[PDB]
Amino acid sequence: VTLHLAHLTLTHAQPSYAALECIPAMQRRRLSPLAKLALNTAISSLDGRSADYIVWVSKYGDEAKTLNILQDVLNDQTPSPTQFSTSVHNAISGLYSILCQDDTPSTSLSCSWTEGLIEAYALLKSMPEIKRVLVVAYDEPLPNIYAEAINFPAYAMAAVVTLEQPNLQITAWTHTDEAEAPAFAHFWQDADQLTSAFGWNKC
Amino acid sequence: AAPMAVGIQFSVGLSALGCELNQIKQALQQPQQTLSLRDDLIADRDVWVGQYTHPLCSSVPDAMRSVDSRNLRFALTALSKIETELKAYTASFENKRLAIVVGTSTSGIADNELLLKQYFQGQTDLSISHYPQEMSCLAKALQQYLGWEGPAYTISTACSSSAKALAAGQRLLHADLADVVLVGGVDTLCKLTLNGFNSLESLSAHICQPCGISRDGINIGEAAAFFVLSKEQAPVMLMGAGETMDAWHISAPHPEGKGAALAMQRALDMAHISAQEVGYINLHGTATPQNDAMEIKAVRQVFGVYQVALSSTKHKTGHCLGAAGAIEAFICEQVLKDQSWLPLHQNVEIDPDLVDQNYVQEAELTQPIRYVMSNSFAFGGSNISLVFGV
């Protein structure tokens, strides 16, 4: 697996998002905090260009929203239908497509950054009409009700991936691991670092 | 020839239809009532569901205790039907070339609903574990169970999850990333899905009536269905996939079916076949007003009028959500293998708007068929259509 990766952008929580100006403020205000992060980063990495396929990646999704729905359900109350419909794991991909009017085909994965890149490679290598793939990872920490919950700053990270003249090679993909998007950004932006123990090399 | 064709070397499909191949075929060929009533999913109401009414393995291996759940047990119950022959088959490939792409919309959430209720009612000092309910847990648990070392990851795109997993495995093979891919999906019944879809008024008051004149929503089902794909020939091959996004509404389909029609056409194109060559379509056919009106419009756009046998099987399996596409692919495979029967559509009065199609009213197949299509149209306007052939 060798890829050309470009336009790497890592976004953290912000009081306002420049990229989201193209979305009318009424709908923009109804995006969850995590939806704002993901959509902002997707637009920013695209940088006015387009993609032939979008791979959205999130380990947890919006677990906070699912928790509130579950409280109602487990209290024998009927949950909010708009909350439920925007709580599914691919809700952000659907929100992006509607609010940015971009019907580009997409998928939503629960996996690490490396597997998102593997899915992108497979799309590019097997499909002649797919020449650019956008990969967008996002996550926020788990509700502290869960035993494994650990705080980290919520984030989205996106990049545009193509096949020709690769600058990235993936040499291992069974650990996968902590091989998350933040670790990748650290590796990618360190000009002196050519290899990573998570199985990435620059080329 | 179809350049993206991949062979279905092994397959398994557990659902309300049964747990043995002969039972499942008879359930689809006859007006068997396969759904079950449940009084413990929605408060103050019974629902018909597609329940797997057979025992699950009472144990997960020791090294996988942390991720145990009914959903995983369902998955391992299905996998063990093919595991022995699969291990004999994979011996001749390198371990790093055995890959896994599976879909789910529930993972093990059902197992945490009890603890979360107790948390919300009083015992505010319990520690609930989150990983058994994460979507990625499915592919990683399966990987650990089989000892495979290729990529393993989970697709979670609501109703299209497992159909997209089949298409993903086809790509992995023709991108030279794997020589064998386990694909499919597993969803289990839970309060979250039943009450989530109830709040959208998407559930039928009784048994669903796909394309019916007075249809009133869906029944939810659970299924565990897997396929072992390789580049080698097999009795049935996955030949084409078509994927589109409606970009219309977060929970209602494009009313002209533009996304669904394009997905179906792209599947035909990738398979290198014309609409005329398809002998049967397994509809998405959920029995909501919006879906069936949209879908039959799209079918008429691509296939015309009275040209192709079709049926929904969601009155038999229920709408299995993340697993819908996989269990429906399994049905499509058996149809092509047997050259004998088609799955019955619900015996209902068809909506006059939708009646200009050849709904399967009797199971006998009278002429051989070479290609079959199956549709999955999900939330967020995620559409996929799969084409299978001999």
Residue numbers in the entry:
A (entry chain A): 2 to 204
B (entry chain B): 9 to 398
Authors' text:
Aryl polyenes (APE) are one of the most widespread secondary metabolites among gram-negative bacteria. APE biosynthesis gene clusters harbor two ketosynthases (KSs): the heterodimeric KS-chain length factor complex, ApeO-ApeC, and the homodimeric ketoacyl-acyl carrier protein synthase I (FabB)-like KS, ApeR. To understand the structural basis of the functional redundancy in the two KSs, AbApeO-AbApeC and AbApeR, from the APE BGC of A. baumannii, we determined the crystal structures of AbApeO-AbApeC and AbApeR in the absence of substrates. Therefore, the two KSs function complementarily in the generation of APE to enhance its production.
In the crystal form, there were two heterodimers in the asymmetric units; we focused on the structure of the first heterodimer (chain A and chain B), which had a relatively lower overall temperature B-factor than that of chain C and chain D in the structure. The overall structure was superposed with the X. doucetiae KS-CLF complex with an r.m.s.d. of 0.68 Å. However, AbApeC was composed of only one thiolase fold domain. Among the conserved residues, Arg30 and Arg31 residues in AbApeC appeared to be important for the ACP-KS-CLF interactions, because ACPs are negatively charged proteins. The cavity of AbApeC-AbApeO was characterized by its asymmetric shape because of the lack of cavity belonging to AbApeC as observed in other CLFs. The cavity was lined by residues from both AbApeO and AbApeC. The volume of the cavity was 120.4 Å3, as calculated using the SiteMap tool of Maestro software package, 2020–2 release. His268 residue in AbApeR was a part of the loop sterically linked to the loop containing the gating residue Phe391 in E. coli FabB. Inside the AbApeO cavity, in addition to the gating residue Phe387, residues Phe85, Val89, Ala166, and Phe205 near the entrance of the active site cavity were strictly conserved, underlining the importance of these residues in function. AbApeO-AbApeC had a comparatively stringent Kd of 7.4 × 10−8 M (N = 1.63) for holo ACP1. However, the 6EN-AbApeO-AbApeC model indicated that the bound substrate entered the cavity, such that the full elongation of the substrate up to six conjugated double bonds was possible, as observed previously in XdApeO-XdApeC.
